[PDB]
Tab-separated table of C-alpha atoms and ligand atoms in Angstrom:
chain	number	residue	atom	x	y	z
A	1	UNK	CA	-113.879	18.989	-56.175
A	2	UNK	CA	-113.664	15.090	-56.759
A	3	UNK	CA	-117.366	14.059	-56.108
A	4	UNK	CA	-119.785	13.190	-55.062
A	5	UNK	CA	-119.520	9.327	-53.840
A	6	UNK	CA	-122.613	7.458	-52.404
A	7	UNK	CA	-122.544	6.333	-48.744
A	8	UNK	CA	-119.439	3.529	-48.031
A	9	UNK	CA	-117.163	2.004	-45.680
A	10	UNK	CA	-113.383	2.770	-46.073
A	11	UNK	CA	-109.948	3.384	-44.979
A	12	UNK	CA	-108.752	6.963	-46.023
A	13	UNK	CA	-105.442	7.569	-47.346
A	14	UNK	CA	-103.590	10.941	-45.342
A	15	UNK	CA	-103.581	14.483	-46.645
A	16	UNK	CA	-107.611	14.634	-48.156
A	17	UNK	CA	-110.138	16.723	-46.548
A	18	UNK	CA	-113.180	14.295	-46.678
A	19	UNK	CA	-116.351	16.665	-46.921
A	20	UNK	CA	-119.918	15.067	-46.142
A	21	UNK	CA	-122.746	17.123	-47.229
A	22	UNK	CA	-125.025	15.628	-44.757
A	23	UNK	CA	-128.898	14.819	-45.848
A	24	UNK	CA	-130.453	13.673	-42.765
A	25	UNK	CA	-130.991	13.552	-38.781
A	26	UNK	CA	-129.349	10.657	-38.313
A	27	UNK	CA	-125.528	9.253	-37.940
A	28	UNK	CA	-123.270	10.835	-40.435
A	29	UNK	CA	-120.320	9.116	-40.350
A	30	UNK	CA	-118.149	6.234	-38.051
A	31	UNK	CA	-115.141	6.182	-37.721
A	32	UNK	CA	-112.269	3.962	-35.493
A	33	UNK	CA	-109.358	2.036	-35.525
A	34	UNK	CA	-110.682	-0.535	-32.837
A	35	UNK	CA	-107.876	0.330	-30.419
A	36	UNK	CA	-107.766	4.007	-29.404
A	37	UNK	CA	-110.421	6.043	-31.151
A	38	UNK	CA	-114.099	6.124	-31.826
A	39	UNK	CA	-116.047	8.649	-33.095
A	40	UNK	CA	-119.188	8.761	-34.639
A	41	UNK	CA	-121.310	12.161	-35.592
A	42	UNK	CA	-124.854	12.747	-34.846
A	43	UNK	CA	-127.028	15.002	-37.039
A	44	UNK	CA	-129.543	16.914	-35.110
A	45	UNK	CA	-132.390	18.634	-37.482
A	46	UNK	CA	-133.066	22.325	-36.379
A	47	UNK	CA	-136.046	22.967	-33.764
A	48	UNK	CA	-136.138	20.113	-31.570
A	49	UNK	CA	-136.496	19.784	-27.654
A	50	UNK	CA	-134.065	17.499	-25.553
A	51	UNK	CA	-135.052	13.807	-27.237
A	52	UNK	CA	-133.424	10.471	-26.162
A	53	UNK	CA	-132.714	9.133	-28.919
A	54	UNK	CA	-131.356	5.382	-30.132
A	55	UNK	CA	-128.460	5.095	-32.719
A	56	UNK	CA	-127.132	2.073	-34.294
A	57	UNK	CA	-123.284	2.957	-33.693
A	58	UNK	CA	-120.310	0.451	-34.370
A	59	UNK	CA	-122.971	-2.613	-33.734
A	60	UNK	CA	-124.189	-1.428	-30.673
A	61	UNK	CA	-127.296	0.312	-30.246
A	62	UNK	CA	-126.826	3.713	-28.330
A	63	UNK	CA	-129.366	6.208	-26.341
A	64	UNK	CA	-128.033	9.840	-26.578
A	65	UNK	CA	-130.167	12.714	-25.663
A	66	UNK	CA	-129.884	15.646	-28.028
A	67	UNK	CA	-131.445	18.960	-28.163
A	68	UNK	CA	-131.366	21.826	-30.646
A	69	UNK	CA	-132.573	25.025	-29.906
A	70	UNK	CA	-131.563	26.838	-33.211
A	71	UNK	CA	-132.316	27.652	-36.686
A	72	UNK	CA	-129.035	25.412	-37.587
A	73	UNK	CA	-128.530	22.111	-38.542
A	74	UNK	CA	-126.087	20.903	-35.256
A	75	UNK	CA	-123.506	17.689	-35.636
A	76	UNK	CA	-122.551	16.124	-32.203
A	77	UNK	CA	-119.030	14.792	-32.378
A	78	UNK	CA	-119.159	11.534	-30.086
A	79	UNK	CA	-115.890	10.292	-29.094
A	80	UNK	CA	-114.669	7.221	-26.777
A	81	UNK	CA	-110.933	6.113	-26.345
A	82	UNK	CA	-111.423	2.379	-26.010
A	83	UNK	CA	-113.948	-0.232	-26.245
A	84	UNK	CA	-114.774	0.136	-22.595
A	85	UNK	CA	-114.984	4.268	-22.190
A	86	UNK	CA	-118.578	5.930	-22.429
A	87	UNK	CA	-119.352	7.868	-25.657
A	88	UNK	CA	-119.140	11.733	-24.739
A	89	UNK	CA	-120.485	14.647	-26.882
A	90	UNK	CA	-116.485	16.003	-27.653
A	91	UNK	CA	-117.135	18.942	-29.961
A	92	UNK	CA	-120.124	20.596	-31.517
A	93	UNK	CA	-120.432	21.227	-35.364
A	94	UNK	CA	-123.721	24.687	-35.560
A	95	UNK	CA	-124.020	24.701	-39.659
A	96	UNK	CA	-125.840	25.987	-42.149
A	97	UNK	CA	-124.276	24.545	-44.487
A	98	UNK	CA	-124.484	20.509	-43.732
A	99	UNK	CA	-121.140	20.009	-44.395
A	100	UNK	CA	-119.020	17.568	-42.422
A	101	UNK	CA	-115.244	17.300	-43.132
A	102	UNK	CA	-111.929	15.135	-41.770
A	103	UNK	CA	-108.435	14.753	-42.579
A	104	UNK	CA	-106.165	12.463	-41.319
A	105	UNK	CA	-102.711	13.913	-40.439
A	106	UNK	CA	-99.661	14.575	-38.813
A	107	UNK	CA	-100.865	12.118	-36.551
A	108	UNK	CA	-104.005	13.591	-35.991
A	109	UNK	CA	-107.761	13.211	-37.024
A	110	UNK	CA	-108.766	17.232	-37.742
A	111	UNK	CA	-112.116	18.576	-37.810
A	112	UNK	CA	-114.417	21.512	-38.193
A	113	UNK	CA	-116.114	22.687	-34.673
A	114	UNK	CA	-118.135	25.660	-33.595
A	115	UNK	CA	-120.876	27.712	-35.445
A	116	UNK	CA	-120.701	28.236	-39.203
A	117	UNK	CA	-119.608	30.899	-41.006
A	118	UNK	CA	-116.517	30.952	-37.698
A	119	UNK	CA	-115.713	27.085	-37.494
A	120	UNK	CA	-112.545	26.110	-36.882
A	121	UNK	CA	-110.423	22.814	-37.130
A	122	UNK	CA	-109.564	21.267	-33.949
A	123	UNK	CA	-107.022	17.422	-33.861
A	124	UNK	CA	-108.263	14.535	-31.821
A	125	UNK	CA	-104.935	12.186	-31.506
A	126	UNK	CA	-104.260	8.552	-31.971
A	127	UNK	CA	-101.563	5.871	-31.849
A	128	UNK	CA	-102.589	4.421	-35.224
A	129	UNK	CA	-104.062	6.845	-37.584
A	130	UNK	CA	-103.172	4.253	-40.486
A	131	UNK	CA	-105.912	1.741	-38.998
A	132	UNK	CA	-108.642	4.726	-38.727
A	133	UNK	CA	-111.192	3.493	-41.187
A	134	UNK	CA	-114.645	5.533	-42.083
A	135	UNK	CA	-118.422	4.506	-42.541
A	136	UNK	CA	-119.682	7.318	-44.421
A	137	UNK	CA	-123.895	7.508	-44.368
A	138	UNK	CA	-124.224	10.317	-47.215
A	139	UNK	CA	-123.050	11.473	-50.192
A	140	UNK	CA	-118.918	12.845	-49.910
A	141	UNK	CA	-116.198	14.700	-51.502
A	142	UNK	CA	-112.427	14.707	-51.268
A	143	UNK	CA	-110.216	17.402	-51.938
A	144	UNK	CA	-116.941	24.749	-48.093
A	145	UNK	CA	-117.697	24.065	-44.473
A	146	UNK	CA	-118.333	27.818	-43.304
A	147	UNK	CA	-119.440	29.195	-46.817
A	148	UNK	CA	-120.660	25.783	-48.620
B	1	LIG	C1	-111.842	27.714	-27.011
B	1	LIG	C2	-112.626	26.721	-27.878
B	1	LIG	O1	-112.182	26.378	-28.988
B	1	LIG	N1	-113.758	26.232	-27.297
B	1	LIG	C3	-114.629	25.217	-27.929
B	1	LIG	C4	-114.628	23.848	-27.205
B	1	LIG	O2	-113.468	23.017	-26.994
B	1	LIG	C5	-112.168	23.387	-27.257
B	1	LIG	C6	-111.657	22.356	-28.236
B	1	LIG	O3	-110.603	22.999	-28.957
B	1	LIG	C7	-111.170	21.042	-27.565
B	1	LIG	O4	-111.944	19.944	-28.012
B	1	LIG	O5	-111.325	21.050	-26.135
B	1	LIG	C8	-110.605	22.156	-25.590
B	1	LIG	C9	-110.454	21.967	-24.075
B	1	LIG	O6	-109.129	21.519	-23.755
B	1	LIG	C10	-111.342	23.477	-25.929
B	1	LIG	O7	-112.225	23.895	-24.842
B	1	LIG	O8	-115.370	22.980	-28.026
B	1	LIG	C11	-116.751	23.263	-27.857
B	1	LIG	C12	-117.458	22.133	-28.588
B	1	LIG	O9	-117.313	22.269	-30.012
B	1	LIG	C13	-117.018	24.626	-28.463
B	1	LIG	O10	-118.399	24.982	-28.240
B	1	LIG	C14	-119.257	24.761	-29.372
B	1	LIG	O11	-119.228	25.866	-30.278
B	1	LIG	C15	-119.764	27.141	-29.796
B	1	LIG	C16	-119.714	28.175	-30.939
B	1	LIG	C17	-121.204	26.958	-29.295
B	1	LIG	O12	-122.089	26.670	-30.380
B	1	LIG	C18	-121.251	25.801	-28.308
B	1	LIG	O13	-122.608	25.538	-27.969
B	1	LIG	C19	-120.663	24.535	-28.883
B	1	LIG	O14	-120.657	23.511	-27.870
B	1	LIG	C20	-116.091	25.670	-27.809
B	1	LIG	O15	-116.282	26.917	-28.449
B	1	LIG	C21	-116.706	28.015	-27.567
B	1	LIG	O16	-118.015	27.826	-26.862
B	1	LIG	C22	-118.357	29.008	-26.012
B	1	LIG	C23	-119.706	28.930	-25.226
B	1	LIG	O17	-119.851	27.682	-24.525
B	1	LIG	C24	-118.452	30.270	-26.874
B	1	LIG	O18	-119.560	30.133	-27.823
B	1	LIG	C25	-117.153	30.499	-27.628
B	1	LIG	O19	-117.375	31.512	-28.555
B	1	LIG	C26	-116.758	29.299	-28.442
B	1	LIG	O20	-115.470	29.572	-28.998
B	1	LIG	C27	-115.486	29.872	-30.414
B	1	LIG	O21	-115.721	28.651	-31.177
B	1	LIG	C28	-114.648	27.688	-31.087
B	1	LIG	C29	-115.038	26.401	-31.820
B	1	LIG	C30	-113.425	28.305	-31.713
B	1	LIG	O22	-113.750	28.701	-33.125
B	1	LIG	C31	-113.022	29.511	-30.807
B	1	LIG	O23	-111.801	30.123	-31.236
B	1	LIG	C32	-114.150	30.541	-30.840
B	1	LIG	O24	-113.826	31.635	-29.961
């Protein structure tokens, strides 16, 4: 609906799907409060064998190995609870479609997980949603993730 903005950093206001239509293999989107939630999503191109790869996440540069074995565009959800904890692949996003989406509330961060056109949302929870704030890496819409 209101659309599309060009890659930015910022703080999302509650109650807005944010949809990402994701253009590339790289990192999609960071997001964190700095206190109790990290998460930053991988894009993995269809057809590739297990890679290491290095990502520029939050400053720091990263190796995670990713792999994709099918015809689908996959988007690693990878989560850490503080500054100390070790990133961990969380959820999995299989899509067609290259669509990305959060919302912020009831306390929660929601997203879409599983294999496209039969994702669901799934909550990840924090102590301060309010200070959750977004690096987005392609072009987004707020108001489509199964369907396009
Ligand atoms: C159940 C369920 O939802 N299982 C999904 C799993 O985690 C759950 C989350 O709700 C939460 O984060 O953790 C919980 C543990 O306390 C739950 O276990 O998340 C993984 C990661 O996204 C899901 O697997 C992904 O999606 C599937 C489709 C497949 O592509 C995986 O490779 C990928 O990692 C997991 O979903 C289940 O995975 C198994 C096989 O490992 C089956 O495919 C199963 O069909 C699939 O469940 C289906 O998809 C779910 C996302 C959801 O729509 C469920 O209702 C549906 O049956």
């Amino acid at each position: 609906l209101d659309g599309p903005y060009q890659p930015t950093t910022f703080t999302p206001p509650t109650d807005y799907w944010i949809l990402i239509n994701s253009n590339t293999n790289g990192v999609v989107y960071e997001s964190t409060n700095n206190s109790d939630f990290w998460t930053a999503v991988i894009a993995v191109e269809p057809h590739v064998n297990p890679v290491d790869r290095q990502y520029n996440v939050f400053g720091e540069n990263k190796q995670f190995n990713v792999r994709n074995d099918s015809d689908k565009w996959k988007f690693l959800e990878m989560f850490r609870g503080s500054s100390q904890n070790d990133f961990y692949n969380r959820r999995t996003l299989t899509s067609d479609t290259r669509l990305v989406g959060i919302l912020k509330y009831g306390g929660r961060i929601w997203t879409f997980h599983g294999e496209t056109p039969r994702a669901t949302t799934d909550s990840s929870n924090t102590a301060n949603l309010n200070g959750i704030s977004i690096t987005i890496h392609s072009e987004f819409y707020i108001i489509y993730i199964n369907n396009g």
